[model samples]
Target: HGEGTFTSDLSKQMEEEAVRLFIEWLKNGGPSSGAPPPS
Candidate 1:
């Protein structure tokens, strides 16, 4: 379980937080993924 972020609203907010955190990681990805990871 997460730290009180199981709700849909918090889920999206958490994703948005990662969006900022991983901004540098997506420097080259843009709308398309430059590298795909293993499932």
Candidate 2:
């Protein structure tokens, strides 16, 4: 992975991980709290 960037291979699991990471950022109040809420 590169600094200040997030990447995931061509797989749904990786995609899920990427979303989870972003969701974490939201949880930590990074930004975009108006985005989709975690399930």
Candidate 3:
């Protein structure tokens, strides 16, 4: 038999928080948060 991986459930609050964070980051500009130019 093959081994199976277990996944944890995320609460509604947790999901909402994650989405909010991502939205804020995206609005502020992701990957371009004042980082040095790539070589």
Candidate 4:
């Protein structure tokens, strides 16, 4: 019921989005796509 609660939820949401982006990037051809990273 403090800052930790909100921060924790935001952290998880960011992590989930990061994972999804990574997976999508890999599916699109991964490093072969000549992409460095999400940036």
Each prediction's RMSD over C-alphas, in Å, is 5.9, 6.7, 10.6, 6.5
- Stretches of candidate 2 off by over 4 Å are 1-10, 32-39
* lDDT of candidates 1 onward, in order: 0.56, 0.57, 0.51, 0.68
Model 3, 1-39: lDDT tens digits are 111232444454566566676666667775688643221
| Model with the higher TM-score, candidate 2 or 3 | 3
TM-score versus the correct structure, for each prediction = 0.38, 0.46, 0.46, 0.67
Name the lDDT of candidate 2.
Answer: 0.57
Better of 1 and 2 by TM-score: 2
Candidate 1 lDDT tens digits, 1-39? 124556677776766666664664467574477664221
Clashes by residue pair, model 1: none
Candidate 4 stretches greater than 4 Å from native: 1-8
1-39 per-residue lDDT for model 4 (tens digits): 112335557777766677787888899899999986552
In model 1, the runs with Cα more than 4 Å from the true position are 1-8, 24-39
